[model samples]
Target chain A: KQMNVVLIGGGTGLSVLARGLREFPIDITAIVTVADNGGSTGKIRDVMDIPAPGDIRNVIAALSDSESILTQLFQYRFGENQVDGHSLGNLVIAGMTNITNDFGHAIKELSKVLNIKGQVIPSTNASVQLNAVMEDGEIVHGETNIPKTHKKIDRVFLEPSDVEPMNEAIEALEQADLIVLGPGSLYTSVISNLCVKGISEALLRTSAPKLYVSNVMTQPGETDNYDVKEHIDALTRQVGEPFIDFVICSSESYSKDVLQRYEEKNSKPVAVHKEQLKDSGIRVLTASNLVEISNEHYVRHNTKVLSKMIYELALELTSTIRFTP
Target chain B: KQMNVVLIGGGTGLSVLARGLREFPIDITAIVTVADNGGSTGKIRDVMDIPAPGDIRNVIAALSDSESILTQLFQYRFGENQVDGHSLGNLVIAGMTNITNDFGHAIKELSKVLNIKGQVIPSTNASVQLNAVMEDGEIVHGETNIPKTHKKIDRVFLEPSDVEPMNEAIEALEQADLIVLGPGSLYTSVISNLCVKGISEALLRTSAPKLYVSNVMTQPGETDNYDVKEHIDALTRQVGEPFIDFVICSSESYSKDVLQRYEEKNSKPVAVHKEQLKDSGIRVLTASNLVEISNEHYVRHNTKVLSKMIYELALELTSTIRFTP
Candidate 1:
């Protein structure tokens, strides 16, 4: 059961999805955003005058062979005085950048070190910082400061204007059996990924099924009130047309006790909004993934459940395939 | 206890020493060599990038409070990859160089981070990469590389001419109660601290009881066929006058079984030639130090024994009302 999976985005949400894909015997390609300007990554990049490698480190850790001590070591950070917030992985990546004298070679060397389970590629080879346009028309120039603007983000763009996508990412999209999106901070992650000029262009050309793993809860400031339909509309607005094929949502809703927990954080599961998706020419797949994995907490997409659904879809798609030999 | 301690050399060694000394409530001052290249200090001084801070990192790490993980982490290193050898400590020091915009302030900030034990001022904050003229007339540049040179070495000198002792190191020397040397490398580590232009000059003027802790094993090539007198003569050759009042050496040699283990690797016990040290005017104190602590089979100074000897001498010197004050 071989499946070609292409996943994109940056942030903890995408890292979680990347973790799920590691155990499967599928060809997984992760396109991580390098536009981070937060904590360790931000400080190192700005201070050392190098490219951001934070997201790459996060995604690498997620896809590394399960139960590796190095994974824990990679995330181990020194917390006092000067090196306080920097992760070992970020430092390793930053050091590589200096040695290779080029950013791309640095990533390649680091990937080998992590011995990751699946393919990982940065979305762009060139160093790119995220620049965002706030709703009130204020321009936030750095990713580290973008969240502080408190205005809804209009869009985030990379500098040097016309940015080219990494060739590996584009190739992954063209070869994917299923392309997975979302399951991360939507605008900063999902749409922010598409904003890279060539990514969506490649996605639009792929005939493979496109899947969107709906977020478990809404993000503050950005995606504050986004429902599943609103998420798709936002994607449509960013990249244009048939960019999505299959929509997956958790059929299980939060229990009454947990719903109050969500209210406290001003978050809730993205409602399916069936009427809104009916005319969109896409099929919605729902299952009992909404149950909490732990006591008094809401559930996230169970990798086992999500993989089963995707596998079934692949089998059906293969049954209809006619090879021209 | 108001113990008097003398630190020798600069760069990584000095930093390591600083880390150890900072925890002890003893009087400490690291006399760091001015020779260093490779990083912000390298960049700043190579083309007027500024004098090196590599040794200062060693001093900072040594003196830094154990709780100051940031400063320790600042010394954090990413393994061999692209950014292979540059250190986080170097970067922070370098970054501060660009920020506070002063090398002096950068060191000061570093001292603050580590809560610098006694004082971390350089022997000479000069742009001096030790340019060595070997006895065989081979020229070697950079202390980092000279140790690897197998040929017998001669004189080590500085570049760009005259030296500028960091005023603070000279001041510390003037007020020191007891001066220590030689728990470090010979030419590059110990004497390098003394030979810094203003350092030896300060020692000549100060009335402190100077002590030298002789290395138990002679370093190959650097100190071939050398005994305690030979090592002392080398230091005096460069810094002028045999000025030390005491010499510390290991009395107990390794067990024959352990000596056999090391003989296979071409390392052996460096016999203490007591007869040769007769007329030196310096009292020689010996102890049973030197033990194998790791699997690598390298000998380490027995910390407890060494510390006892140091504490004893410190008590003797302090009771004498010795005043470099």
Candidate 2:
């Protein structure tokens, strides 16, 4: 009745999926990227000189008891100091890091305090930066401004490639019945975790089935006009060998109004190439109603639909002992 | 089995007692003073320009689940940063204040986050300062410096005293089955609450019995050479009426090492004159083991013994309508 599921990546995708998956009977271990240097988290990361806790905040807010007023408070952003754009959750994590003097410990303490549904681990504890090499052979610094270059990304890597993963993170991955990667930012969010030293290597060791919940649209600079295999290739490039066993991509079409809005931002629905992915020995799963419009009209993955598919896979995988720690 | 008990005070004493009372079945409402500008709280008050959250922090730590790691984290003071001397707890409260744009709402949000056992309300919502008149009629400014004057304090009151009490604080007092004051600083921690416009007057309207938990020792400047009745008089002096119905005083003797240590700081055990106290028609109760020495060898009330006595009284008071909500 219990299966270990590890969700890797950063940004809103991992958070959205965690919200729905936590409702099921599986245990979750979220290995979020610490490469974030944007918005609310980026500010505190500079001030506190700690790993970016932005995605960890979003994930924690998601896995927390939905009925608690604290969950709402955690997601609240101030309209008011340079604290202006910061979420109370991010500030609180910084405060915890200040107390414990360790970023990993800070995440652990907050997880218990928020009484989240499962463990939320930062991929690496070090204060590392993301350095991206563009297709034009130009280099971009910081996750905050990488996409703004509007140049195609060649490969993104953490500046110091020698950071240690929390053993709990490795343990979770080794014990996982299933490992789900994003529907988050292509280069910076999902693949960024592989930038850590042992993480990708652990994927090579674990018997677990690895799945990628592909983003619905192409990102501006990172994966613009990229096909499904192109997305999978970026991940394999980071891991150094083909690792994703399966990939979930959207085949659903959007309304003209939603399509018009996204296209206005220089975005397009990601191409799903079935035979191309199958040739690489990766199973292709499709979701017809797999996307929804956010309040700002941005398309977000339908988390419930994504979660339902993942749960069925988890149930089958665990029942057959397909995964072993 | 349930009783509404309001504890009105600030500083370590109110916090210690609340920690004990929360273990009982009584619903607690802690009305902490806002005139403080000391230590961790003083710095944030200047930056945030809000009422000092020092005692509110203490009371919150007191009423929160002791088993929770957050309670420990809340009490932890950062040894580094001018964030130095600041408690992680204090920083969090300030962040919450920034979120809700109101300090009272901030306290409420944190109470829920920490899953504290009872309500913690500030005496007033406005930024306030304390001014004390010494025996020589030399006026002292600020609660932080009031006790440093080494002159006998005649009275201490908040400046711009027209500040309103939070309506919840007034409601808690008026509906309380019992109102307990002190076991904290006489002039600053406890009496400062009277500085708010409506707080002192509400005690007059409430049928709840007002109990004074007397300090075991006299503070250096504020209550030097003060007797039990003298301390009692200072409270009545502000209320304009003999509002206290009962008093609990310590009769225990301390070890020579502890007594010598306190006297080294020019402090002495407060003299409890039961007859003089009874002459004012106030019932007197005593605890033999009410005091203990702190890490730095300062005297503190033994909260468990205190809570036991208070809980028994709550049992009787709630069984009858001697006091009604």
Candidate 3:
């Protein structure tokens, strides 16, 4: 029998992890963040007054067993117009939502059409705007503006603050034998999902081992010069408790040229502070999860290594043997 | 054994016919006109550079066995903004076409999702614009402006003039035991499809018995005082030869109140000119196919009555017994 694994977060990181996780023999349910307010998704939200569809669209394509042509089609953007820069998949989701009357219901119906490998659920069906409070007490409104501030963000929260979590998402969390979070933006993608009222409650209520995959590289203003411990701190502070039991930190290094290129953008690799994590009462597991590619300089987790580690962790938690570092 | 039948036309008339015909046991293929440039479809075409989807969307919904909620969802229109007044199904087709790289391919994939009972094919895959020449030698552009001219239309033709017919559509026509044409707009819906370069040739080459469903009410400008003979004349003039073997004309009449309402709009019932048809070498069939409903005051063909007539016609043409009047 396959184990139930619930993965949470959003953006390309969640999609990357999902691509590898689907290859394993496990029942995966992806609970994605809907707090995006950038580019194509933002335009749709402005016009239709619906949940942002950008992240959900990517996650759906990542989990789909459709042909490559279809995946490319979903990701294709419309050229300059009133509908300019919008992904076809975003438009499809918006259209489907118009039909289903609920964003969650639309995703469910479209999953069938795409022949998705596993279930993909939004963290919540409500239209959420992610607002960040800077360290200087300055409020930054919208996800698109948060990164442009270049100031330290104290915290991020949803506008309504009482957006209801989807019942299916809560149920999936409760039934999970292992819960995986992150490898995405700390506050925007990861904590944005956890900030939903019931989702955070379900995380604390579940008896499963919860793991956090720390980001390999720091984001510009969000996590600049931060260590692995700081990433966990932001996650724990947002949820009101340290619900995580294990932390996976990448110890891989990139080529100097790649490092210089990221530095030009005011970013760098996140340092793994093992002693600090140990003092915080969380088990630390470090691995070289850097992706190997030529020319491209984006920091991405190696799907094969990350997925294998997750499977092993699941096995270790269920078995009678005690795992030692 | 099921007999193969191919129906040609577009707009509400095509949808009404499809709703009735799906009740029969014959294999049906609907070849729809894609020259529509009005409302939601026109807006999408302006942005997406694809074939208009308004008629195709309706026909799919009419033939769908899926839940009513889904059908309603596809038919739902956006209330305002850049994407305003566009139907969800139209966006879906536009998005699907972006992936498939061909309009016909998009329809094939969407049909599976809608669980359509009969096959729906576009007359052609090209983005066609319908142009009409007025009786005074003035040319009118766009489908929306043509009907509002209030002048007699001399001829209607496609802009590209060399638009290729879908291969599957031609194959369906060749294999059909019987062929059916409109209860739709004479020039715009029915002949607009036939104006595609190859479609007219296929109609001429098909050995099957052909039937024409004459409109119950004459359109204001295009066929204001048109009799059954004039409708047939327009069809033959467009295709360059006499192609229809049998013509179905409505014999039922509306109440005095409804007749007056239609007269206020400058529309009237088409009178049957059997003698003119006899001189032109075409068989004429009459039926009480007008739909009965209270207070709506719109001319419509009854699905049950229409479908039964088409089935009987198919049987008469195929069986060994001579179908004598």
Candidate 4:
């Protein structure tokens, strides 16, 4: 029987991992953030008062059958005046929500249509704003606005402070043989899940080995000049304990030309503070070939190589805890 | 070898026939009217500037795999405020228009996903309004508004006089072993196709033996006090020739209670004027059991009976004219 792996976080990184990991035989449960408020997702949320579909939509695409005709249309965004930049997948998800009248059920129904590799669960069913208290004591509301504030974000929190986490996500965490956190936007994508009440609790209590795959470069306004140690500290701090058993980083470099261009966007390679990480009781995992420069010149994880490492880690950790098939 | 049949019309009746006729060994090409401008179909048409998907979506459901999960979701309408009364299928087709950047292509893609038994084609790809001139010489605009006018419609036409019919639809008709019209809204659905520039010309020129499966009951506003004779007259008048080979009508009677209830809504069984039809050189085909009274108290076509008659007619007409399989 295949193992169950729960990948938590949102935005592109979660989808990328879900897409690559699907090549393996393991069962994946992608728990995504719904606090996204930007562009099409924000427009839909304002109109319908529903959870954002942007992150959930991407995960659906990532987990869908490759070369699928429906999947091809699912990600196609309208470029016209009315629905400009609005994705078909997002619209379908929003429509499915009304049909099913439940956000989580909408995700499940759409996933079934795409014949996706695994189930995608929202971090919460509620439509929420990702609010952050800046280092300068100025408060920011909304995920898109959080980064634009340009002030160092102290910590991110969900609006309606009492928003409940999707119980299935909590159950998925507890049952997962291996659990994963981002390679996405640190505060907005990855940490936003922890803002939901029960998520951090599940992370603290789940017996599964937890891994944090660090982003190749820091986000411009969100994590400017932040290093690998900072990402680990931020994640571990969210759960109220240092339970992260492993931290994977790209022990690699980019071309000077690529580096110079990325720095102009206020982004650079995250330094692996090995000595500092060693003292924190978290096992540091590094791969020289973990980095890839995309055609658009953006630094991305070499998903296949990184996924192989993840598969090995899953197999190694789950061997002793065989369960009934 | 299977014979080719082209069914033309819009709304519920066409889908009913398409759904049932699929059981036969004939190739079906459903050419639907996209001039719909009411409810969900109109909403999509206004935003997308594409042909209304309401009729196309219904036919897709009719010809789809019976137990399809996606098909179920396709027809499911949202019961909420923002997207209320909007169908998921219509939205998908609208989204598909942007994805494929072609309305005809959008219908083809969605019909492919549904794994429909037959192909569906729009009468025309462009969005055109269905305008009608009342008996008083007063003209009314919109398909939905035309019926609301409650005045006897003299004739209906597409506003853009140069509106082009889909070339494939023309080809489907010309090459068909048997051509079909109606069992739907008389003026808006069946006759509206004739308003498209090339459709009437194709009907006149096509070698196929044409058939009209007439609606069992008259629509209140669109076809008030009309009989099977008027229906035939209106259709034959539009084509500028008497080429209709056969006219199928329900000879059976409904319960007195049902008839009275229907009449209360200004609807009644279409009187079959055999003498009027006989002198017009069109063969009248009738069946005693060609009607079904639904739980919703609506009179509907007994599609299986109607479809069988159509299939047999296709066999009789196409025997000597064998084409390449």
Candidate 5:
């Protein structure tokens, strides 16, 4: 029997999950958010009132088995000159949007050109600038500016109150067997997906088993000082309890040098909060550390292994009584 | 009687000429060079390996009426973001290229989209990058890098020898009443058009009279201390002497401040060498200054007026002599 899966988020978090899912036979539908306001995506959306192209591009890049040199080159960016930090993917997407004369039309054409397998649609076709309201009511307009913000975020919302969820994603969620959230920034990536006006209600209404992939380390200036349970708690605030079924964690031991680097950055390695999850009725699945540590010290989840773990757990869960309810 | 005019060069120059032609009933076919490297057009051409989109974009934008704000916005650049410094027109052209998957097809589609009148075709469809040989005999591989070097250019040539000229441009020129050149950067822009392997040979062999529009001011770096006669001499050297018929010069005065700014930048005024042109077997047409001094301090040719001057000269040339020699 085939299982339908919906993976959600923005940036690298969703990118990894999309890659992982590519190896499996599960029917995939990626519901990408449009809150990105950093780089090429931001510039196009800001100036032209188009949906952010960065996350959509990331999802498209991850969908195929063989990432072509074209896709790889599309992801290349210049750090100098006037273009400083724009991605090639964002520009392509922007170009598509301009040609179609409509944001959705561009993505549809790009999806065909990229030969993307799974449907990667924006949460909405409306051009949205992510607005974050502080606890003190200070409003930051762009999503890029919201993360490093000192003030605690009261809530994030879109400019137009009537934000419609992509009908395809909604229809997909209604028929999905499993839903993957994160392996991404808790507030920005994971929560932003749920924050897409109508998506939370759709997810709550959908019968699919929802999974949350916890961050291995808290993000500084954003998720600072937060641990495994705190990750869930912050998520529960926006999405509510009983919706998230399982929280996936990393278990591999870290080298002394690597731990020291995290220590200097004031980020402690994530530990399993088994005792805390026991009370909340949410299970924690601790697998091998899902990280790609390079010489440059950039940390990213290993997409293949992460997908394997998700598939194994999903199969077992589907056969068990947990899936029946 | 209908007049067939063949306008040359690309980008801002084409747009200026197109805008000028639209005011009159003259039949104009713009032969735009497609060798460009930078921004959205660069990305599209690199991926698609087609003719450059920059000049086509400018021509489309120029063909839009002055009251057309929507069309003008198409030329707007979304600068300094992830999408970084790409024009809306660039994206539209890219989208069309992706759809048609060919440069010629894309131009046709974009023409309809922009509602542009007249034909805009590439000088050559087999994608060429301008390769310049410096005075030191060092050859540069691409167009973008050659412009930045401090070395004086000896001669520039195109890759892919005998790349067939676009049949549309060639046929248009073959039947044209008059062909106009320049009112652009001399070495890179104007001369680059002449060096397209077979274009100079085509121009020399064609029966139509080719006109050269002399620059209002000499460039400091490239054509340092170049007079109107020297500019014509350089063209004659490249395209063979028979290709040039008339030299157009602006007899208008510049504001002292503008002249001072040009002088400070080491750009000496390129005054018409009327006597020199008389001896060189080329007719000289002098007109009032045709450059615009906008409040923003950007100096550009007043294309509307320039087009009118071109039309007047074209009428005289077409009616005066039916040469059999």
Candidate 6:
């Protein structure tokens, strides 16, 4: 039987994982965060009174196996006129949401049109805002501003706290053999989905082992100088205890020049802190998950290697001894 | 073997015919007019520098057999904000056009997503204007304005006068067993498609029998008090030759109240002069094609009745006498 996998997160990280996971045989349901209120999504959400679609749009494009032109069309951004700065995919989702008068239904329909490898859905259907509180007691609202704050974050949350998670998401969690989180922004992308009222409740209700793929680099303003243990602490603090089982941290080394460059932007490699994790209830799984592009200073997870790690973990959790990743 | 049928028109009439024809087994190619310069399509065309997509959008919606919500979403229009008056489908097409950098490719990709019953092609890929010269030598630009001129149209033609029809349309004409013309406006919808230099030339070159479905009621500005022969005259005049071999005219009668209501708007039923058509080399097939709605004052063609007539005519033209309508 194919293992049911529900991966929850948003941003470029989720899409990268989704692309890699498509090569595997496990059933996938990507529950994406809809708290985006920046760039094209912010403009549309402000005008249309619908949940931000930028992240969802990227997720769909990543999962799509349709015509390359169709995918390119969806990701295409307008350069001029009233539609300037708006992506074609975001506008499409906005149009779909208006048509169905329901954001979740629109995603369901779009997935079929895109011919995606796995199911993609929003954490909540409501129009929402991501609000952040700094460690210094200064509050910053909006996902876009949170990263620009350059201040240590105390906590992050979604507006309209009563927003209901789509039933499909809850059901996916209930039936999931393994639930994976992260490799995305700790507060804005990952916890934003968990912030939904029903999402956390569903996570706790599921018997599946909950895993977290720690971000390789710290995020400015949000996770500046944060290590693997701090990332886990923030997630557990927000969602309450008994939430995480395994923490997958990158053990790969980066070039000195790349580290120096990231440091210039107030970001650094997140330390695994294996010694500190030894006593914690959460098990630490370390892997060489870094992909260093020589020209670009940024680091991306080696998706194939990460996906293999996930597949092996899933099989082990399911007690299936004969599986090969 | 499926009979190849190419339909040419725009507005509600084309969509109606497309809806009815989808019930049959024939291969359909809807060649729609893109001369629209009003409403959502016009706004987007002006802003995006793309062909008007309103008519093509409706045609695709009519041909789609996807979920009802998906089709409905495509046809849904925004009620307010920067996106107000824009139809979801039109914007989607515009976005697709930008991605493909070609209008025809966008339609092809959209056709796959909609799971349409037939292929839909725009009359031309260029951002064209339908210009008309009035009987008084006054020239009116735009399809919206031509019908509002309230004067006899001398001739109508496309601007960028060198606009090329999609290759699919030309190929469809070559392979067609029968070719169909309007049940739409005389100058704007029907002739607009014919105005594309290549379309009329294709019709003249094809060996397929050419049929024209005449409008049931006269359009006030376009064909006020016009007879069936005059409608055919306008088509042939624009195309530069005797283009139609057969004409389908509605013989259905209307009540005095309905006729009186239409007359108030300077509209009247088209008079089909049987004597004039007798030796004119053009066969006139009359039917009770009017679909009367007691509450609605407007006249509409009975799509089912119209489609059946075309199906039977196609079989007769192909000398393949075994079809059940």
The TM-score leader among the candidates is 3
In terms of docking quality, how is candidate 6 classified?
A: acceptable
lDDT by residue (tens digit), candidate 2, A25-89: 98989999998887777777666688998888889888898667667666767555423456667
Q: Could you tell me which 10 consecutive residues in candidate 4 chain A have the lowest summed lDDT?
A: A78-87
TM-scores of all predicted structures: 0.54, 0.81, 0.92, 0.85, 0.56, 0.91
Over 4 Å off, model 5: A64-88, A98-101, A131-141, A151-155, A251-256, A289-300, A317-325, B1-325
DockQ of predictions, in order shown: 0.05, 0.28, 0.40, 0.45, 0.06, 0.44
- Tell me the whole-model lDDT of each prediction, alpha carbons only: 0.70, 0.84, 0.84, 0.85, 0.73, 0.84
Candidate with the greatest lDDT versus the true structure: 4
What order do candidates take by TM-score, descending?
3, 6, 4, 2, 5, 1
Q: Note the B-chain TM-score for every model.
A: 0.86, 0.92, 0.94, 0.93, 0.87, 0.94
Give the range of the ten consecutive residues with the poorest summed lDDT in model 3 chain B: B286-295
Report clash pairs, candidate 4. none
Q: What is the lDDT, from 0 to 100, of the residue A215 in candidate 3?
A: 80
Candidate 1 scores a chain A TM-score of: 0.90
Clashing pairs in 6: none
lDDT, candidate 3, B5-108, per-residue tens: 89999989889888888888888899999998988888888877788899989888889864644565567676676466667678768777866788999999
TM-score of predicted model 3? 0.92
Where model 6 places Cα greater than 4 Å from the true spot, the runs are: A66-72, A80-82, A251-254, A288-293, A320-325, B66-69, B250-254, B288-297, B320-325
Every model: iRMSD: 11.6, 3.5, 3.9, 2.2, 9.4, 2.6
- What's the CA error at residue B88 for candidate 5, in Å? 5.4
- Model 3, position B250: C-alpha lDDT score: 66
Candidate 1 per-residue lDDT over residues A1-325, each given as its tens digit: 5777888888776777677666567777888887777787877676566667777788888888645544655565544443444565677566567556767667776576667777788877777777888878898887767766677777777775577788888988988887888677777677777878799898888898788878777766677777888888888777877678888886456677677777787777677777668688767887765333658565566766776676666557657666798
User: Which consecutive 10 residues in model 3 chain A have the weakest lDDT in total?
Assistant: A286-295
DockQ of 5: 0.06
- Best by the DockQ measure: 4
